[PDB]
């Protein structure tokens, strides 16, 4: 722990938890949001026999544990799970006590207000954090980009959000949430791999196939033409070496998996591709600034490490929108940490401690005070 009473910066992103100290450039403890529980009961002795397993421990013990998600698309299952994982993060991973450091947290866009009230109340009772602040990840990604104008595409693991912000002003009237995310990607890839001869249901293979998505997946420039040329495609077809050692070969599926977000009709969504959701979002607001939105679009999330989103994005928007002004996307490398960086940025300036949510305000007005203290 630093000698100074600097604040805690924790991004509880929908899919990854990244925690550390204020003034740091990158979060120190970063782990996926999976939680493992003993698949069977206790009869043995001498070691183990522990209920909750979180972090890399559960990653190593994936096979023996039922792998469960305490949060999915924002919905909260069991607050005890968050209690334990935050205990682990603060003491076993961050080696910090929350008594002496206020916490800045980031929440998924348009999270329930009742969810905020309950989570804040359990937090304040269970923990002894001196002060509090929670913010939407959209403005955090904006801060990471450091440009007040643009539309943020936050692609988490449970929801994809499109949020327009002009000159550092939120536009909730033009903000939308789409239920397509990593979960859907894994599902669709699971069914295609089932049609390829490999049919698995458990979560270990879920992580294997999301790793495959991280490594080999394409974003098709032209879809049906690329499957037409991918009929044989000995060179274009790509293989992976699974940890057991078998060589699993995939061809068109590499660019037929992310395509589903662009083409939701593959597995039955009324909503069109996410580019349509950015398009409608843009036109909902006044006409004039729309061009700037076209030229200032930002994309954020862990998924963004994949190739192909930028070219597809610009080409389709230019197809939909007039091609007079030039559209260009901006995306700094390793932007999944960017939100946490913005949290540090929030703690950088000396005005931030004017609106810390202190203990006594919550003791006076209950959780309801946040309704007036954040917004």
Partner 1 sequence: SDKLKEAETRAEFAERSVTKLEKSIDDLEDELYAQKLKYKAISEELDHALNDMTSI
Partner 2 sequence: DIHRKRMEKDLNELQALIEAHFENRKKEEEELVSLKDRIERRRAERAEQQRIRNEREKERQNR
Ligand X SMILES: Nc1ncnc2c1ncn2[C@@H]1O[C@H](COP(=O)(O)OP(=O)(O)O)[C@@H](O)[C@H]1O
Smallest distance, partner 1 to C-beta of residue 230, A:
14
For 82, the enclosing helix (H) or strand (E) is helix 79-87
Which residue stretch of 59-67, 152-160, 244-252, 345-353 sits at the interface with ligand X (rule: CB under 6 A)?
152-160
**3-state SS class at 260:** helix
The entry of partner 2, partner 1, a second copy, none near residue 225 (CB within 5 to 8 angstroms by kind) is none
**3-state SS class at 94:** coil
Cα–Cα nearest to 302, from 192, 184, 160: 160
According to DSSP, the residues that pair with 243 across neighbouring strands are: none
How would DSSP label each residue in 14-54?
Answer: TTEEEEEETT-SS-SEEEES-EEEESS-----SS---S-EE
The entry of partner 1, partner 2, Mg ion, none near residue 146 (CB within 5 to 8 angstroms by kind) is partner 2
Rule CB under 8 A: say whether 269 interacts with partner 1.
no
Instruction: Lay out the sheet containing 298-300: strands in order across.
Output: 176-178, 160-165, 150-155, 298-300
The entry of ligand X, partner 1, partner 2, none near residue 15 (CB within 5 to 8 angstroms by kind) is ligand X
Contact 274, 153 (CB under 8 A): yes
Smallest distance, partner 1 to C-beta of residue 318, A:
21
Rule CB under 6 A: say whether 107 interacts with ligand X.
no
Rule CB under 6 A: say whether 16 interacts with ligand X.
yes
Where in 145-174 is the site for partner 2 (CB under 8 A)?
145-147
How many Cα atoms sit within 13 Å of 340 on the Cβ side? 27
Near ligand X by CB under 6 A: residue from 135, 305, 310, 329: 305
Near a second copy by CB under 8 A: residue from 197, 245, 322, 333: 197
Q: Compute how many residues bind ligand X; rule: CB under 6 A.
A: 17
- CB neighbours of 351 closer than 8 A, spacing ≥ 6? none
Near ligand X by CB under 6 A: residue from 81, 93, 107, 157: 157
Rule CB under 6 A: say whether 273 interacts with ligand X.
no
Rule CB under 8 A: say whether 172 interacts with a second copy.
yes
Where in 337-356 is the site for partner 2 (CB under 8 A)?
341, 345, 348
Rule CB under 5 A: say whether 11 interacts with Mg ion.
no
The entry of partner 2, ligand X, partner 1, none near residue 182 (CB within 5 to 8 angstroms by kind) is ligand X
Nearer to partner 1, 216 or 285 (CB): 216
Cα–Cα nearest to 22, from 6, 38, 44, 37: 6
Rounded CA separation 220/141 (Å): 27
Contact 65, 53 (CB under 8 A): yes
Rule CB under 8 A: say whether 144 interacts with partner 2.
yes
Which residue stretch of 7-15, 68-76, 144-152, 212-220 sits at the interface with partner 2 (rule: CB under 8 A)?
144-152
Residues in the chain, how many? Answer: 375
Which residues would be at the binding site for partner 2 (CB under 8 A)?
A: 25, 143-147, 332, 341, 345, 348
């Amino acid at each position: 722990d630093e000698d100074e009473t600097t604040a805690l910066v924790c991004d509880n992103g929908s899919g990854l938890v990244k925690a550390g100290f204020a003034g740091d450039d990158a979060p120190r403890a970063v782990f996926p949001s999976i939680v493992g529980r003993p698949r069977h009961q206790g009869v043995m002795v001498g070691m183990g026999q522990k209920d909750s397993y979180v972090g890399d421990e559960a990653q190593s013990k994936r096979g023996i544990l039922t792998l469960k998600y305490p949060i999915e698309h924002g919905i909260i299952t069991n607050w005890d799970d968050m209690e334990k994982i935050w205990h682990h993060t603060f003491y076993n991973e961050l080696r910090v006590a929350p008594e002496e450091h206020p916490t800045l947290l980031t929440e998924a866009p348009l999270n329930p207000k009742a969810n905020r009230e309950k989570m804040t109340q359990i937090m304040f009772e269970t923990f002894n954090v001196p002060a509090m602040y929670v913010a939407i990840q959209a403005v955090l990604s904006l801060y990471a980009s450091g440009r007040t104008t643009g539309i943020v595409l936050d692609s988490g693991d449970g929801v994809t959000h499109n949020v327009p912000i002009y000159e550092g002003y939120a536009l909730p009237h033009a903000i939308m949430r789409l239920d397509l995310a990593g979960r859907d990607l894994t599902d669709y890839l699971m069914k295609i791999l089932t049609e390829r001869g490999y049919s698995f249901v458990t979560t270990a293979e879920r992580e294997i196939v999301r790793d495959i998505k991280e490594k080999l997946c394409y974003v098709a420039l032209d879809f049906e033409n690329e499957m037409a040329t991918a009929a044989s495609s000995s060179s274009l077809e790509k293989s992976y070496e699974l940890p057991d050692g078998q060589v699993i070969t995939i061809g068109n599926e590499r660019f037929r998996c992310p395509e589903t977000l662009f083409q939701p009709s593959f597995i039955g969504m009324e909503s069109a591709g996410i580019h349509e959701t950015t398009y409608n979002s843009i036109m909902k607001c006044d006409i004039d600034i729309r061009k700037d939105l076209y030229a200032n679009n930002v994309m954020s999330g862990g998924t963004t490490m994949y190739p192909g989103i930028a070219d597809r994005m610009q080409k389709e928007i230019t197809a939909l929108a007039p091609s007079t002004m030039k559209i260009k996307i901006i995306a700094p490398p390793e932007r999944k940490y960017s939100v946490w960086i913005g949290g540090s940025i929030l703690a950088s300036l000396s005005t931030f401690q004017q609106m810390w949510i202190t203990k006594q305000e919550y003791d006076e007005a209950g959780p309801s005070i946040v309704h007036r203290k954040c917004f």
